[PDB]
Write a protein that binds this ligand. Structure first.
Ligand SMILES: N=C(N)NCCC[C@H](NC(=O)CNC(=O)[C@H]1CCC(=O)N1)C(=O)Nc1ccc(N(O)O)cc1
Length: 245
C-alpha cells in the first residue's frame, strides 16, 4: 500500500495473509485475500497461476505482521485451490482475476470469529456503489513502487471509486479495463495499492454493511497520475463464487 496508515488486523479482521512454502524450506509471502465464509478465502488468480499446487500454500487469519507472530492468529492449509478457468493476462490487464481457497486447519477446523477474525459480506448480484464513493484497501504490499521489501505491519488506505467512463479514457486505461473490473484511486493520486497487495480487499459501505466490492488486481505502476488501481468487480462473479462454494 502506497501512503495511508499502518493498522492492525482488528480493523480488517477478514484479511487473510497467504504464503508459499519453498521446496527447500523457505516460506515467503504471496498475496492477500478475504475471508468470505468460515471455510473460504477469496483472492486473485494471478497470485497462484505460476505455481498452482495447493499443498505449497499457507493461509493465516488474524495476522497483523508479515514475518512475526500476532496473538490470536490461526494458520490454515489449503484444502482446495480454485482458480478461474477463463483467467487471462494481457499487456496490463488481468481478466477474470479471482480465486478461491478452501481452508482447513491441521486439526480439521475452519475459521472461528474472534476479536481478530471475522467474515466480510459479498455484495448482491451486480450491485456496486456509486462512483465517487470512498472505499478501503488493505495489504502487506510495497509502500513505494521502487522498494525491494514489504512492510512488516499491515497497512490500509482510502481511495475513491471511479466511473468506467473516466477509467476508459485513453490517457487512463482505455480498452484494457472492462465491466468485470472497477477502478479506484486517490483524487490527488497520492495513495494506492501496489505489488504485494494483490488478492486483498477493496471494502465499501453498502446498505449499512462493509461489503467486499473488489479484489486488488492490477494498475500501471503504483499511485501514478491517471493510472488508477484496478480491482476485480466482485458483484459480477457471484455465480462463480456460489458454484465453486
Ligand atoms: N493498484 C495498483 N496500482 N497496482 C496494483 C498492483 C497489484 C499487483 N498486481 C500486479 O502486479 C499485476 N500486474 C501488474 O500490475 C503489471 C501491470 C503494471 C505493472 O507495472 N505490472 C500485485 O500485487 N501483484 C502480484 C502479482 C503476482 C504475485 N505473485 O503471487 O504471483 C503477487 C502479487
Amino acid at each position: 500500500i502506497i501512503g495511508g496508515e499502518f493498522t492492525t488486523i482488528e480493523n480488517q479482521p477478514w484479511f487473510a495473509a497467504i504464503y508459499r512454502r519453498h521446496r527447500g524450506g523457505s516460506v515467503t509471502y504471496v498475496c492477500g485475500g478475504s475471508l468470505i465464509s468460515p471455510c473460504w478465502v477469496i483472492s486473485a488468480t494471478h497470485c497462484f497461476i505460476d505455481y498452482p499446487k495447493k499443498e505449497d500454500y499457507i493461509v493465516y487469519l488474524g495476522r497483523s505482521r508479515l514475518n512475526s507472530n500476532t496473538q490470536g492468529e490461526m494458520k490454515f492449509e489449503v484444502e482446495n485451490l480454485i482458480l478461474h478457468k477463463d483467467y487471462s493476462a494481457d499487456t496490463l490487464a488481468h481478466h477474470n482475476d479471482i480465486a478461491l481457497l478452501k481452508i482447513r486447519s491441521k486439526e480439521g477446523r475452519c475459521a472461528q470469529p474472534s476479536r481478530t477474525i471475522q467474515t466480510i459480506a459479498l455484495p448482491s448480484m451486480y450491485n456496486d456503489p456509486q462512483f465517487g464513493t470512498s472505499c478501503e484497501i488493505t495489504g502487506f504490499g510495497k509502500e513505494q513502487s521502487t522498494d525491494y521489501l514489504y512492510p512488516e505491519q499491515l497497512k490500509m488506505t482510502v481511495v475513491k471509486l471511479i466511473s468506467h467512463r473516466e477509467c476508459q479514457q485513453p490517457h487512463y486505461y482505455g480498452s484494457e479495463v472492462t465491466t468485470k473490473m472497477l477502478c479506484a484511486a486517490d483524487p490527488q493520486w497520492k495513495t494506492d495499492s501496489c505489488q504485494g497487495d494483490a488478492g486483498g480487499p477493496l471494502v465499501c459501505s453498502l446498505q449499512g454493511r462493509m461489503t467486499l466490492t473488489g479484489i486488488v488486481s492490477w494498475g500501471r505502476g503504483c499511485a501514478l497520475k491517471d493510472k488508477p488501481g484496478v480491482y476485480t468487480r466482485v458483484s459480477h462473479f457471484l455465480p462463480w463464487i456460489r458454484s465453486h462454494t
